[PDB]
Design a protein around this ligand. Structure first.
Ligand SMILES: [Cl-]
Ligand SMILES: [Cl-]
Ligand SMILES: [Mg+2]
Ligand SMILES: [Mg+2]
Lengths: 276, 276
């Protein structure tokens, strides 16, 4: 019964109010939605921002405003900023890093996506990692394929990533890795042999796989991610009313597998973050 | 005692005479070099072509000229044409497919490469797969990562790929998949579970991993790829004097593992190809 960190990916770059009005687009919406999720048991907020038309942006002032709002209203919660390539190109994707958030997301490989290639050129990957060292930001590696995990290990090896990489297995992405239990256990095998038996890791499923990946991760000793960024539904026929509702579904799974939900303090201890 | 097919990748896109003067660039060189490798025991020729200045190109007329040369000088040999993204962009990479070769290489996912993203967008992948059905070309799926194998399965399921996908494990590419034994064995577990205990597969290592992946493949029931496309050295100390010398090393490993080098007819049989 080891503590389980729940991350909430609140907004992403694709979901719109038409997909689900619960999707927080504005700053006010985002702070409220995260506050509910924080209370529901999320300890990390994975953050995207949108512009005034509601479109994905990497604008650093918008990130600063959300970071500040979450530190005000969700004090203690771990703030994770997105270097996602759906929201900008090249070094623009790291323009928010000097804000010194606790964590940032990092892709270390490329892969196909539903309608396109997800491009993460090696030079960019290196630059984002070095910026993260520069600002003592703890990365979360969004592993879309197995080699991505091996590359995190290499980068640890040669000092491009600090300490023990924290990898997220991302499954259920059309054209990338489906939600496959065999591959999932192999990912767990890989993280443990390369990083050590107690290296923390987590996983996220897109759409209907979200709840599945929650159960796989929670039942196996991993940490979980959920939220509207990845999936807007409770089941096939029902929209999720809030990010907090999705977090609750993960907490239920923690109860089922007899694992306590990690407090923000515990999450910080486990991931080697500043006490804050 | 199970036959092992040896594939020789003769030229590729990047090697030059400065890397190794044995690298065949002109039509006449590629014919001689390939004949040599054919006599040493290779039964598939994986072909790229180069322009008058020695630069990569997808020119279908150059391909037409080489295919004819190999069909005349190496009758029986399986001709495999490259749809590689270093020699062309978009549908240009499939402009040689109407020549109706036995085989063409096919990437069904994207991944990073030593200096850049190796882009294979889903629509292009499907377009090329479709052209392969249309000209009754057998694909060899060049799998740079785990999900590429799982996509090949999904493509067989819905009819995009015909028959049983013939997958090549590509390892030792910087920024993609290292030559890792654990992973290699999981790749075998994976082909077997998804495609059948007796579905054929092959493996290719780049640079020093070439001979390594030859041993792993041959000792494991697989088929072997070699050639100056992937590696120009015999060892630390010496350049390979020919494509044939690299095939020769594979042939020695089959002896080591008491497996007979497949004849060209056996290769055609194993891979479901047409008769000559
Ligand atoms: Cl490259
Ligand atoms: Cl196309
Ligand atoms: Mg994100
Ligand atoms: Mg090639």
């Amino acid at each position: 019964g080891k503590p389980c960190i729940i991350c909430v990916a609140i907004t992403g770059s694709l979901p719109t109010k038409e997909n689900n009005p619960a999707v927080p687009i504005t700053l006010a919406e985002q702070v409220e939605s995260t506050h509910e999720a924080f209370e529901a048991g999320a300890s990390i907020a994975h953050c995207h921002v949108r512009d005034d038309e509601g479109r994905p942006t990497s604008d650093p002032d918008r990130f600063a405003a959300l970071k500040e709002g979450l530190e005000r209203h969700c004090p203690g919660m771990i703030v994770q900023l997105s270097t996602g390539g759906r929201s900008g190109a090249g070094q623009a994707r790291g323009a928010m890093l000097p804000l010194c958030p606790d964590m940032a997301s990092l892709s270390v490989g490329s892969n196909n996506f539903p309608t396109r290639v997800y491009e993460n050129p090696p030079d960019l990957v290196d630059w984002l990692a070095a910026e993260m060292l520069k600002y003592d930001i703890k990365p979360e590696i969004e592993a879309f394929d197995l080699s991505h995990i091996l590359q995190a290990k290499r980068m640890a090896g040669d000092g491009r990533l600090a300490g023990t990489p924290y990898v997220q297995f991302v499954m259920g992405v059309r054209n990338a890795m489906p939600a496959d239990r065999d591959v999932f256990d192999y990912y767990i095998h890989t993280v443990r042999r390369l990083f050590g038996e107690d290296a923390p890791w987590c996983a996220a499923g897109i759409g209907p796989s979200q709840i599945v990946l929650n159960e796989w991760a929670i039942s196996s000793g991993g940490h979980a991610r959920t939220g509207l960024e990845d999936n807007v539904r409770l089941d096939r026929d029902r929209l999720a009313p809030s990010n907090a509702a999705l977090v609750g579904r993960a907490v239920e799974l923690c109860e089922k597998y007899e694992r306590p939900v990690a407090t923000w303090r515990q999450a910080r201890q486990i991931l080697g973050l500043r006490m804050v």
